[PDB]
Design a binder for these strands. Structure first.
Ligand SMILES: [Ca+2]
Ligand SMILES: [Ca+2]
Ligand SMILES: [Mg+2]
Ligand SMILES: [Mg+2]
Ligand SMILES: [Mg+2]
Ligand SMILES: [Mg+2]
Ligand SMILES: [Mg+2]
Ligand SMILES: [Mg+2]
Ligand SMILES: [Mg+2]
Ligand SMILES: [Mg+2]
Ligand SMILES: [Mg+2]
Ligand SMILES: [Mg+2]
Ligand SMILES: [Mg+2]
Ligand SMILES: [Mg+2]
Ligand SMILES: [Mg+2]
Ligand SMILES: [Mg+2]
Ligand SMILES: [Mg+2]
Ligand SMILES: [Mg+2]
Ligand SMILES: [Mg+2]
Ligand SMILES: [Mg+2]
Ligand SMILES: [Mg+2]
Ligand SMILES: [Mg+2]
Ligand SMILES: [Mg+2]
Ligand SMILES: [Mg+2]
Ligand SMILES: [Mg+2]
Ligand SMILES: [Mg+2]
Ligand SMILES: [Mg+2]
Ligand SMILES: [Mg+2]
Ligand SMILES: [Mg+2]
Ligand SMILES: [Mg+2]
Ligand SMILES: [Mg+2]
Ligand SMILES: [Mg+2]
Ligand SMILES: [Mg+2]
Ligand SMILES: [Mg+2]
Ligand SMILES: [Mg+2]
Ligand SMILES: [Mg+2]
Ligand SMILES: [Mg+2]
Ligand SMILES: [Mg+2]
Ligand SMILES: [Mg+2]
Ligand SMILES: [Mg+2]
Ligand SMILES: [Mg+2]
Ligand SMILES: [Mg+2]
Ligand SMILES: [Mg+2]
Ligand SMILES: [Mg+2]
Ligand SMILES: [Mg+2]
Ligand SMILES: [Mg+2]
Ligand SMILES: [Mg+2]
Ligand SMILES: [Mg+2]
Ligand SMILES: [Mg+2]
Ligand SMILES: [Mg+2]
Ligand SMILES: [Mg+2]
Ligand SMILES: [Mg+2]
Ligand SMILES: [Mg+2]
Ligand SMILES: [Mg+2]
Ligand SMILES: [Mg+2]
Ligand SMILES: [Mg+2]
Ligand SMILES: [Mg+2]
Ligand SMILES: [Mg+2]
Ligand SMILES: [Mg+2]
Ligand SMILES: [Mg+2]
Ligand SMILES: [Mg+2]
Ligand SMILES: [Mg+2]
Ligand SMILES: [Mg+2]
Ligand SMILES: [Mg+2]
Ligand SMILES: [Mg+2]
Ligand SMILES: [Mg+2]
Ligand SMILES: [Mg+2]
Ligand SMILES: [Mg+2]
Ligand SMILES: [Mg+2]
Ligand SMILES: [Mg+2]
Ligand SMILES: [Mg+2]
Ligand SMILES: [Mg+2]
Ligand SMILES: [Mg+2]
Ligand SMILES: [Mg+2]
Ligand SMILES: [Mg+2]
Ligand SMILES: [Mg+2]
Ligand SMILES: [Mg+2]
Ligand SMILES: [Mg+2]
Ligand SMILES: [Mg+2]
Ligand SMILES: [Mg+2]
Ligand SMILES: [Mg+2]
Ligand SMILES: [Mg+2]
Ligand SMILES: [Mg+2]
Ligand SMILES: [Mg+2]
Ligand SMILES: [Mg+2]
Ligand SMILES: [Mg+2]
Ligand SMILES: [Mg+2]
Ligand SMILES: [Mg+2]
Ligand SMILES: [Mg+2]
Ligand SMILES: [Mg+2]
Ligand SMILES: [Mg+2]
Ligand SMILES: [Mg+2]
Ligand SMILES: [Mg+2]
Ligand SMILES: [Mg+2]
Ligand SMILES: [Mg+2]
Ligand SMILES: [Mg+2]
Ligand SMILES: [Mg+2]
Ligand SMILES: [Mg+2]
Ligand SMILES: [Mg+2]
Ligand SMILES: [Mg+2]
Ligand SMILES: [Mg+2]
Ligand SMILES: [Mg+2]
Ligand SMILES: [Mg+2]
Ligand SMILES: [Mg+2]
Ligand SMILES: [Mg+2]
Lengths: 63, 117, 144, 137
RNA sequence: CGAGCUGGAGAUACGCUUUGACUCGGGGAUGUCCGAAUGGGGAAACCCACCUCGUAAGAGGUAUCCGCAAGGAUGGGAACUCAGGGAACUGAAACAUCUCAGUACCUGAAGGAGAAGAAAGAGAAUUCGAUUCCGUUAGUAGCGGCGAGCGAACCCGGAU
RNA sequence: AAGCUACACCUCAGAAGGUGAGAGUCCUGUAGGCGAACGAGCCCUGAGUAGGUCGUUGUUCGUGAAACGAUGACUGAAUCCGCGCGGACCACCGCGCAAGGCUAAAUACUCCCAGUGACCGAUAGCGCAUAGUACCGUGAGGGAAAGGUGAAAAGAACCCCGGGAGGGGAGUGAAAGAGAACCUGAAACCGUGGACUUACAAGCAGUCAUGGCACCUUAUGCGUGUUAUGGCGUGCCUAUUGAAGCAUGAGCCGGCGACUUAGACCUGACGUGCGAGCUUAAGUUGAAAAACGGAGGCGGAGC
RNA sequence: AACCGAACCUGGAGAUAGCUAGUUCUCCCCGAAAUGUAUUGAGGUACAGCCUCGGAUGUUGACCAUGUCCUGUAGAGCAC
RNA sequence: GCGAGAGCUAACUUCCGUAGCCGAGAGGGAAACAACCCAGACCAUCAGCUAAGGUCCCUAAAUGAUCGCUCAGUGGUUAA
RNA sequence: GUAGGGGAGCGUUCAGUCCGCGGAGAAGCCAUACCGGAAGGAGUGGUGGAGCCGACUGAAGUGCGGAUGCCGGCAUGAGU
RNA sequence: CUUGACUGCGAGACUGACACGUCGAGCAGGGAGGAAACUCGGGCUUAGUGAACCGGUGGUACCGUGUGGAAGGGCCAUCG
């Protein structure tokens, strides 16, 4: 058998593309925020780098 | 399929044991001290071979100046004076020349001394 | 089939040990022993049909006798199959594999030490390859 | 052929690792390192402080069309292909889904394919070359 | 079946058997005492009775619950089935929800199997057509200190 | 003699076991055939209910927007223009008739029997080559080791020392170099004999060098055994910054003893088949053999 | 019922064991780490850093010279 | 060893930086001796040259040559 | 050259196929001065008394010095 | 005088094992001060800070399980 860790799916980590692991951008969630308007905006979609092998087998079938 | 150890282990052990000839005591009879003695014996065999080269070096030399001083010069001022006599180069085990023919080692003494003048 | 807890975790002076049923014991329990299992696996179809074709092909260096009917055996008796084969160079210095269709005709020699029978279908990249010659007979499977 | 003389392709079987079994390699400690939690085993892909927990934006469903890019479609030589002929001639594996086409380089000659729906710009390049396309009325 | 047989037993004496032994296949008939034990008691295999049979020696009966009555039940089974109860180590790198797992264990009932079974269903095609089992769907849909982790069904292909 | 050999023979029967060692044709059997008296065996259509509130729970269902079934407590309907469901709920649209019962087969298991085995073969295999015995326990309960004369008992008459035990002869047998402490018979351990050695010696027990004395069946040599004397030389493992360590372990020898298995699971290397396409699962039929089986799975489109 | 801060027996059960010990045939090639961050973390783990194998590329590497910019230690000084 | 803090300008102390060695490094020297000095062991040889370090006897090799010094066994154990 | 990665291989049982061997004697055991780069393999002799080698392929309960490891045998302490 | 204590973006780089963190020319919509060039996406700079989960409040109309809605969920903004 082999589960997906459903902590991967609707969480960041899109699997997509030429096999590389996109993730999101994190801080200032909906926890409180004054702070800058150019950071409140720059929290869209990141993509990680040297951890991908771990992320992939979290969710190798792309759920 | 089972595949027990039989015949294998006795053969190995017997080859170790047979390496033990006049080993003292349980060195010759119990496998474990026989094999362990052989580990240290490995050490000794290799080191000694290299050393035996250097040991006969020493025996060589120790005869050569004994004859040299019998003719009134030491090793130092002799193997110098053959090499300073250049083409004279026989070098390897002059020991035996000094130890059997003295009529010859005397001529080599005269050659070395002539070269140092 | 053995027991419990054996004795003193500490203080007996004997070694540690826990029960009489472990591989370090000369009692019982093989650690990593055989257990019943299956080894059969679906080998890809293309390769086994290619296999029997190559096997029949390997006998076209020197081998493979007639695919057609050639049965002048008196209904079904071995001595007469031995004569039939003996006229074809099947004197039995070479083991030979026969394949056909008539129970009456393979029955002639299920006995002889050289030949062994197999019906149509049920051929074997191993069987035709392990006998020294192939009496292909049964022309029906041979041609399409 | 000689069964004595059968031989598997070189390099197609390599031998197992026999871990233990000598100081000629893989002595004492097995493949393993010495002490540490490396021993009779467990614990998975987890770092046991804080595992990079990023937040979760979520919507549960989906349902996607079966694809027929038309670049193979033009070299096809056979034309006017109703698509229930196509699943039962080649391509379109999916029985559970619906079919769609899309633009891939050219279109060229005439045809008439009855797919479940297709890109609007295929009609920009299928209508040219005198072709119909039936969305399933 | 067609000459042996008299258990293992290997030790003799004694016999039996071609009017068929011995051995094998199939029926009968005997069947002490205890044991569900059941006439009453009991520390199993031993104590003590009663009633008709009645010449005696011996035989037959005498528990309870179902039922008018026949006739039935009680106890015993390696595992398998269903049911009434129902853990904890453990994992969660601590622990409460959670997992382990309705697992182990106990108890009840039954058989060669059992359970289940003939749609106030599945489900989204105005499709299907009792139950069970296998493959696949699919680790998908979902569940979840949204953690550890747990995890369907429909369609479709088979067994019947 | 069953092996070798030379000439034969059967074969629907050359599967196997026994027989003084390896038997197609010596025995039991085998293919095939027959085969018993009694013997076993395919106007209605379910109410203290449906429904509800409280507690709970089952299926993916952890109170979540939480439907539906389920009962523990209290309540409590309607009839065919009627009743239940379709995941709060409503309308429409669909599916179905609850509160009565029975029901073979496909499924599971293995005390028991048969066949088979890239299963064991005496520390293995069941605990047992038989034993739930001996033995341990008040009990519940736990729980051993287990083997071999020879083809055939022909199982050693008789004699000798000895109370015997034990042995030596004679016999039998191919062998007693098999004698009942009965196949082989390793090693640790105990001895007897022989060679070379050792009673001023300091020693991890060796190693290398040279002399001495024996010996001559891979062997007169660059031999083999053993010695005297010189040089050199801190057991093994583990654990460690660092082990001869006065740090762990170990009396010795024999045998047992530890990186495996599983799954249509993931991810790579190598190899084969077919290749823009590759492949089957459950099963069916055939089995001294394997074919069939497209349900389904992977590429092919991404955001 | 000859060891009672919770009896004995059998079962779950091969509990779990970041801890100790042990892990056996051979030659050849290369060859480390005890650092940095995080950690109910400190003798354990995760990611880096250092090893190896295979593929790709192809001197991009290494010292050393010349050119150029950056620096406030040694020394020194008393202008804060 | 060098550069610093902590320490008593202690420690075979502790904690950073920096080079080298041991760790995993055999061989020669330093009497003995992981770290110091020389030097990185593919195998064989009863052949030759050197390094550190040595040349009275243990113990391989100048009782070497030329100028001096110390008469303390200084050499072969600190200072005010 | 330690952990570690890589390469080529030796030996054990079982299975398939081949080549064969065996009472004028098999496996096993025992001695040995031969051979191969190692794991190892052969020669000859002694013992034994019924099975077995070599080659190629396949599958493993496949290689022990340690575990206060297990079972068994036998020693030391001691003629105490 | 007024809000650039702006919405949509982000070429390139510093820094970190990640995950975070820093600086930012220039493009659009719209403003602000200046006569203009031009400068404005907080403060001379370096401290004034918390991932994720679960929830509150305002919009949006993406999902919403037969269909049409609604419950519930998502996206954007914010609070704890
Ligand atoms: Ca005495
Ligand atoms: Ca004493
Ligand atoms: Mg996507
Ligand atoms: Mg030495
Ligand atoms: Mg010289
Ligand atoms: Mg002790
Ligand atoms: Mg056993
Ligand atoms: Mg395998
Ligand atoms: Mg493997
Ligand atoms: Mg290796
Ligand atoms: Mg260890
Ligand atoms: Mg463990
Ligand atoms: Mg896991
Ligand atoms: Mg924490
Ligand atoms: Mg597909
Ligand atoms: Mg008879
Ligand atoms: Mg008898
Ligand atoms: Mg009674
Ligand atoms: Mg009774
Ligand atoms: Mg009665
Ligand atoms: Mg607990
Ligand atoms: Mg836990
Ligand atoms: Mg709990
Ligand atoms: Mg059970
Ligand atoms: Mg029960
Ligand atoms: Mg019962
Ligand atoms: Mg079906
Ligand atoms: Mg026979
Ligand atoms: Mg014959
Ligand atoms: Mg009704
Ligand atoms: Mg109700
Ligand atoms: Mg409720
Ligand atoms: Mg909750
Ligand atoms: Mg409803
Ligand atoms: Mg309900
Ligand atoms: Mg609905
Ligand atoms: Mg065997
Ligand atoms: Mg046994
Ligand atoms: Mg035994
Ligand atoms: Mg037992
Ligand atoms: Mg007792
Ligand atoms: Mg008793
Ligand atoms: Mg016998
Ligand atoms: Mg006697
Ligand atoms: Mg006698
Ligand atoms: Mg005789
Ligand atoms: Mg005798
Ligand atoms: Mg004997
Ligand atoms: Mg006797
Ligand atoms: Mg015998
Ligand atoms: Mg014997
Ligand atoms: Mg003696
Ligand atoms: Mg003697
Ligand atoms: Mg003296
Ligand atoms: Mg003396
Ligand atoms: Mg002494
Ligand atoms: Mg000596
Ligand atoms: Mg220490
Ligand atoms: Mg040391
Ligand atoms: Mg000691
Ligand atoms: Mg010690
Ligand atoms: Mg310790
Ligand atoms: Mg001790
Ligand atoms: Mg698969
Ligand atoms: Mg499955
Ligand atoms: Mg007491
Ligand atoms: Mg007692
Ligand atoms: Mg206790
Ligand atoms: Mg345990
Ligand atoms: Mg458990
Ligand atoms: Mg614990
Ligand atoms: Mg190297
Ligand atoms: Mg930090
Ligand atoms: Mg640490
Ligand atoms: Mg790493
Ligand atoms: Mg490379
Ligand atoms: Mg570069
Ligand atoms: Mg360069
Ligand atoms: Mg200064
Ligand atoms: Mg200080
Ligand atoms: Mg220190
Ligand atoms: Mg270390
Ligand atoms: Mg080093
Ligand atoms: Mg050194
Ligand atoms: Mg040294
Ligand atoms: Mg020295
Ligand atoms: Mg010193
Ligand atoms: Mg030191
Ligand atoms: Mg050293
Ligand atoms: Mg020199
Ligand atoms: Mg010098
Ligand atoms: Mg000297
Ligand atoms: Mg002088
Ligand atoms: Mg022989
Ligand atoms: Mg040999
Ligand atoms: Mg015999
Ligand atoms: Mg093993
Ligand atoms: Mg070891
Ligand atoms: Mg041992
Ligand atoms: Mg013992
Ligand atoms: Mg203006
Ligand atoms: Mg700007
Ligand atoms: Mg809202
Ligand atoms: Mg709806
Ligand atoms: Mg809403």
């Amino acid at each position: 058998p082999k589960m997906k860790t459903h902590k991967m799916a609707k969480r960041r980590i899109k699997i997509t593309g030429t096999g590389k692991v996109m993730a999101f951008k994190s801080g200032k969630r909906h926890q409180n925020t004054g702070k800058s308007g150019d950071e409140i905006r720059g929290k869209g979609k990141g993509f990680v780098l040297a951890k991908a092998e771990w992320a992939r087998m979290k969710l190798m079938l792309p759920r | 399929p089972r595949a027990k150890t039989g015949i294998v282990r006795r053969r190995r052990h017997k080859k170790v044991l047979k390496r033990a000839k006049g080993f003292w005591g349980s060195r010759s009879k119990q496998y474990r001290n026989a094999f362990q003695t052989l580990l240290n014996a490995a050490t000794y065999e290799y080191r000694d071979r290299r050393n035996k080269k250097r040991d006969f070096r020493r025996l060589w030399i120790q005869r050569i100046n004994a004859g040299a001083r019998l003719h009134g010069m030491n090793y130092s001022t002799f193997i110098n004076g053959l090499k300073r006599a250049n083409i004279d180069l026989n070098r390897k085990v002059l020991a035996d020349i000094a130890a059997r023919e003295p009529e010859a080692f005397k001529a080599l003494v005269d050659a070395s001394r002539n070269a140092r003048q | 089939k053995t027991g419990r807890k054996m004795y003193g975790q500490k203080g007996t002076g004997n070694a540690r040990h826990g029960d009489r049923s472990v591989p370090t014991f000369v009692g019982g329990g093989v650690a990593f022993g055989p257990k019943p299992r299956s080894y059969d696996y679906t080998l890809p179809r293309q390769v086994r049909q290619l296999g029997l074709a190559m096997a029949i092909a390997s006998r076209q260096e020197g081998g493979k006798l007639v695919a057609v009917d050639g049965f002048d055996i008196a209904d079904a008796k071995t001595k007469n199959f031995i004569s039939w084969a003996k006229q074809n160079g099947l004197d039995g210095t070479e083991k030979v594999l026969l394949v056909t269709d008539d129970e009456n005709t393979r029955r002639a020699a299920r006995n002889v030490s050289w030949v062994s029978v197999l019906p149509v279908a049920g051929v074997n990249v191993y069987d035709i390859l392990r006998h020294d010659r192939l009496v292909i007979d049964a022309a029906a499977l041979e041609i399409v | 052929m000689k069964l004595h003389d059968l031989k598997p392709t070189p390099g197609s079987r390599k031998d197992r690792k026999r871990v233990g079994r000598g100081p000629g390699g893989t002595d004492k400690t097995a493949g393993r390192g010495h002490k540490g939690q490396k021993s009779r085993s467990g614990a998975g892909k987890g770092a046991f402080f804080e595992g990079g927990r990023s937040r979760l934006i979520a919507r549960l469903p989906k349902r996607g069309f079966n694809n027929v890019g038309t670049t193979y479609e033009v070299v096809k030589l056979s034309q006017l292909q109703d698509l229930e002929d196509t699943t039962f001639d080649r391509d379109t594996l999916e029985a559970y889904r619906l079919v769609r086409r899309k633009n891939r380089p050219v279109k060229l000659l005439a045809s008439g394919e009855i797919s479940r729906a297709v890109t609007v710009h295929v009609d920009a390049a299928s209508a040219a070359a005198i072709k119909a396309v039936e969305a399933a009325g």
